[PDB]
Design a protein around this nucleic acid. Structure first.
Ligand SMILES: [Zn+2]
Lengths: 97, 76, 116, 58, 58, 209
RNA sequence: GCUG
DNA sequence: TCAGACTAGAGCCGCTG
DNA sequence: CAGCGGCTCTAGTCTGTCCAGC
């Protein structure tokens, strides 16, 4: 939330982001701007590249290609605002190796 | 062996960070720590004695790679 | 005290013509404008003019920057053969990533183009 | 506004293990960083790595 | 200027203080210079565009 | 005038000699180094010194590779060049079996003539130069470094030393004036020798694209 | 609207 | 509020046939 | 004598304008 009245918390702006890049601090930038804000998991079907739910893909009517991806929630939100605009972000996922 | 002998600042930060997380998760400590209750302090002591069980794999832009042991790299 | 010689300062925007009038030493005339220098002398002279002009402006206000920073900025603006700005238009010619482009300016248009 | 623009454009550049500066796509911006390979934060002199008169006296 | 002889024989020994230099000092000088050069190189991984961006912006 | 007009026909010819010497065509040092008074001896006033046929140069020959390889430098009298002037130039080139020519136009070239130079033939390549560009040898300008056109056996070492592909090198346009001067084409690499602030040098490379 |  | 560097149009004249 | 075509020119329009707090 936004501030002191609402026990809101503090903002890591676009300028503080530019500072941390210049230190090469890749994991701290991941901790601050993902883990301690909006960490989430989505089911992604590797066949159609769309998001699914509960390990089920309604588009394919199958259960075998679905996988879990660690994603910021604001990006999941973006990936559902864009589909309603009919801009489809079809993902492709490799293994983490 | 073309890559710099000296360990980079970025390499030291990650090696200490992974080692501290490993020590904080009950890994064996090779430094006989004396009165240390903080994983990051224990990890830094290990680096000074050059006894950290981690190998740094340096990937060249083309895709070729060279592996340097933490002990082999000079620490400044 | 050692010498007295007259240089000619031209407030205008045709470098090629001033390089070609009888009695101007064309090998040693310069311009502020990177677009004129690019059109007349090519990308590598334009690259040096970005270095010279940023460093001139910094020194006048008493700032100092190591030359390696203004060097990298100029190499970034000229590596594709044309002097590309740090504007949204230059960044769209340098950067391939949709989400990088959509996270700066024109956030709607880049996302519909990637869909098309 | 200027700072936002410059950073968005230059954020990607990284100095590589083969002593080159490359974009994220793998194109070359510079074959060696700054011509010398040297770090601005380490300059004991005016843009130069050492000052020999001072070092010999030390 | 002072008529010093390189064999070290000249009687007012204080003359050898004027521009003194010893082999040990030459050895330590060359090692200090060579070390300071190697440690002044821009280390691989450095986010060198973000330093460039902020150094012109500030 | 007449003093000023001959001055151009000397400086342009001198620059054309310098361009031919840089491009590897064989020009004698007497042609390369001339004086306006020596030029006056061959021709003096604007009437006697005629731009259209008097100064035309087919002397240049690529001694390094082909004695037959030859270049015609043509200065058209008309300020804007039509295809008709280009067609007369092409017929002269077709008979001699020469494949390269330079056309030195005085003010410009008409659009339909410019289109012809793209498509007349890949085996008959002609380069437009404005004379206002040739009054100053840009390879001797203080802001322009030394450019050196690299051999294929050296490009294959550049790409091996860094483990690059060609399309990761920096680019230079063929429209670039230094690219026109050396007459380089797409897929050639130029070495560029930038001067340092110190006595040293920095070497960089660009790809024509 | 003001503080930063 | 203040550009600002894109995107079509309206031509224009003159060779281009 | 007529028709492309690029130039050239209006001008039209959409696009920005620091970080944050209360
Ligand atoms: Zn599916």
């Amino acid at each position: 939330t936004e501030g002191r009245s609402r026990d809101g918390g503090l903002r890591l702006g676009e300028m503080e982001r530019d500072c941390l890049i210049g230190y090469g601090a890749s994991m701290l930038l991941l901790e601050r701007l993902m883990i301690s804000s909006d960490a989430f998991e989505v089911d992604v079907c590797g066949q159609c590249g769309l998001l699914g739910y509960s390990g089920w893909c309604h588009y394919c009517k199958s259960s075998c290609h679905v996988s879990s991806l660690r994603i910021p929630y604001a990006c999941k939100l973006l990936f559902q605002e864009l589909q309603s605009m009919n801009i489809i972000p079809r993902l492709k996922l490799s293994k983490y190796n | 062996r073309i890559t710099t002998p000296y360990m980079t600042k970025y390499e030291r930060a990650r090696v200490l960070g992974t080692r501290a997380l490993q020590i904080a998760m009950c890994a064996p400590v090779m430094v006989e720590l004396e009165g240390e209750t903080d994983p990051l302090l224990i990890a830094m002591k290990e680096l000074k004695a050059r006894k950290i069980p981690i190998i740094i794999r340096r990937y060249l832009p083309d895709g070729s790679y060279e592996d340097w042991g933490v002990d082999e790299l000079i620490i400044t | 005290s050692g010498k007295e010689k007259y240089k000619l300062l031209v407030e205008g925007d045709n470098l090629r013509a001033v390089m070609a009038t009888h009695g101007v030493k064309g090998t040693r005339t310069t311009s502020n404008n990177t677009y004129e220098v690019e059109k007349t002398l090519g990308i590598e002279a334009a690259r040096t003019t970005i270095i010279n002009e940023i460093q001139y402006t910094m020194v006048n206000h008493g700032m100092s920057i190591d030359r390696r920073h203004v060097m990298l900025l100029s190499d970034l603006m000229t590596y594709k053969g044309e002097v590309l700005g740090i504007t949204r238009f230059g960044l769209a010619k340098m950067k391939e990533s949709v989400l990088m482009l959509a996270s700066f300016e024109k956030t709607a248009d880049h996302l519909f183009d990637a869909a098309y | 506004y200027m700072q936002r623009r410059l950073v968005k454009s230059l954020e990607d550049l990284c100095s590589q293990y083969d002593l080159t500066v490359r974009s994220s796509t793998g194109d070359i911006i510079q074959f060696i960083y700054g011509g010398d390979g040297l770090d601005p934060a380490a300059m004991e002199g005016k843009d130069e790595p050492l000052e020999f008169k001072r070092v010999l006296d030390n | 200027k002072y008529g010093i002889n390189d064999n070290g024989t000249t009687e007012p020994r204080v003359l050898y203080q004027l521009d003194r230099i010893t082999p040990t000092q030459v050895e330590k000088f060359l090692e200090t210079c060579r070390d300071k050069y190697m440690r002044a190189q821009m280390e691989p991984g450095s986010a060198v565009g973000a330093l460039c961006a902020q150094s012109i912006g500030e | 005038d007449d003093e000023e007009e001959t001055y151009r026909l000397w400086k342009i010819r001198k620059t054309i000699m310098q361009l031919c010497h840089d491009r590897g065509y064989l020009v004698t040092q007497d042609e390369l180094d001339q004086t306006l008074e020596e030029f006056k001896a061959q021709s003096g006033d604007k009437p006697s010194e005629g731009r259209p046929r008097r100064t035309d140069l087919t002397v240049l020959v690529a001694h390094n590779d082909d004695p037959t390889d030859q270049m015609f430098v043509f200065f058209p009298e008309e300020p804007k060049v039509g295809i008709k002037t280009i067609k007369v130039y092409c017929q002269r080139m077709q008979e001699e079996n020469i494949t390269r020519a330079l056309i030195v136009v005085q003010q410009g070239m008409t659009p339909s003539a410019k289109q012809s130079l793209v498509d007349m033939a890949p085996k008959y390549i002609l380069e437009q130069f404005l004379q206002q560009e040739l009054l100053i040898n840009i390879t001797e300008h203080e802001l322009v470094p030394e450019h050196v056109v690299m051999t294929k056996e050296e490009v294959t070492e550049l790409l091996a030393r860094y483990k690059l592909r060609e399309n990761q090198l920096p680019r230079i346009q063929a429209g670039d004036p230094v690219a026109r001067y050396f007459g380089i084409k797409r897929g050639q690499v130029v070495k560029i020798i930038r001067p340092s602030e110190t006595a040293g040098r920095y070497i960089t490379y660009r790809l024509v694209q």
